[PDB]
Amino acid sequence: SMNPPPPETSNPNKPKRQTNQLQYLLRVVLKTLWKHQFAWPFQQPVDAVKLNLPDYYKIIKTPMDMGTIKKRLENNYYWNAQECIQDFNTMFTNCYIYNKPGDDIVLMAEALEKLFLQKINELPTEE
Numbered sequence: 001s002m003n004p005p006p007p008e009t010s011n012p013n014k015p016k017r018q019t020n021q022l023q024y025l026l027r028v029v030l031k032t033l034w035k036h037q038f039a040w041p042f043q044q045p046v047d048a049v050k051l052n053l054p055d056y057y058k059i060i061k062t063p064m065d066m067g068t069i070k071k072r073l074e075n076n077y078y079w080n081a082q083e084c085i086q087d088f089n090t091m092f093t094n095c096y097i098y099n100k101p102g103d104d105i106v107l108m109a110e111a112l113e114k115l116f117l118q119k120i121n122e123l124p125t126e127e
């Protein structure tokens with residue numbers, strides 16, 4: 001309140017490469033998390049105006065969400081799987097910083113994180 005613009009998702013200046021890890025992150029990791037029962041609050045940027053939380057972007061200076069992550073993968077924005085994994089981690093950490101521990105939103109993030117960590121453990125060897 002006001003809302004910032006959403007995170008950048010494309011840069012045609014950035015070099016691009018398709019790898020088996022980035023593919024997996026899109027087609028497996030993002031897809032499985034997106035479809036989870038608890039995914040819906042994490043599918044787009046926090047609208048702090050709509051939610052009437054004017055402090056949200058006073059506290060969270062590195063917002064991230066799965067809608068942004070989806071687009072960055074589509075746009076070949078990431079050179080490395082680690083860049084993408086960091087964005088997921090940022091999304092979770094933001095939720096943990098902003099919200100009271102144990103609140104339902106935190107439990108929802110925790111569940112998605114547990115699933116994300118399981119999929120990351122199965123990240124294919126770079127080929």
Ligand SMILES: CC[C@@H]1C(=O)N(C)c2cnc(Nc3ccc(C(=O)NC4CCN(C)CC4)cc3OC)nc2N1C1CCCC1
Nearest residue numbers: 040041042045046047048051053056094095096098099105
């Ligand atoms: C930004 C803080 C935190 C967070 O970290 N994320 C990511 C977040 C992302 N998106 C949402 N979204 C919504 C949250 C609540 C509602 C909603 O309609 N709540 C009803 C209000 C009336 N009540 C009788 C029934 C419940 C709708 C939402 O989006 C349309 N909430 C989030 N929260 C929550 C904000 C309030 C709890 C914590």
